[PDB]
Amino acid sequence: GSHMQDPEQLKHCNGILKELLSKKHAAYAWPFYKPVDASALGLHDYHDIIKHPMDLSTVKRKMENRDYRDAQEFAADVRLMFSNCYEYNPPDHDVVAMARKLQDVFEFRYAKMP
Numbered sequence: 001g002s003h004m005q006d007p008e009q010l011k012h013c014n015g016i017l018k019e020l021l022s023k024k025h026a027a028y029a030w031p032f033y034k035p036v037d038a039s040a041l042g043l044h045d046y047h048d049i050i051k052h053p054m055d056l057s058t059v060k061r062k063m064e065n066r067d068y069r070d071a072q073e074f075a076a077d078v079r080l081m082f083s084n085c086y087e088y089n090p091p092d093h094d095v096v097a098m099a100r101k102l103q104d105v106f107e108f109r110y111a112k113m114p
């Protein structure tokens with residue numbers, strides 16, 4: 001059920017999303033900008049292992065379209081994106097190191113929800 005605080009909490013989520021996409025974090029956010037193109041990258045098992053792909057452009061579309069009804073729904077998708085990275089790749093992969101840094105940006109600012 002919708003709460004009067006949901007619009008304002010979703011604005012905080014939108015601010016986080018804008019930050020994740022910003023130049024400040026681009027050195028480690030870039031693998032998460034667009035859907036994984038598994039065929040182009042030679043990752044021919046990606047869709048056998050990752051049943052629910054997610055990326056920041058999809059989060060952005062869902063925000064713009066008012067798909068997310070509350071902050072928890074938004075956070076679940078961002079976390080799904082990171083989890084997919086932790087599931088698919090070995091833990092010493094550079095993309096995992098980038099995911100951990102971007103997730104730290106996300107989690108610390110999400111925790112500051114007004």
Ligand SMILES: Cn1cnc2c1c(=O)[nH]c(=O)n2C
Pocket residue numbers: 031032036041084085088089095
């Ligand atoms: C999210 N993303 C974007 N590019 C990649 C990945 C990944 O998980 N593994 C991986 O190997 N590559 C190249």
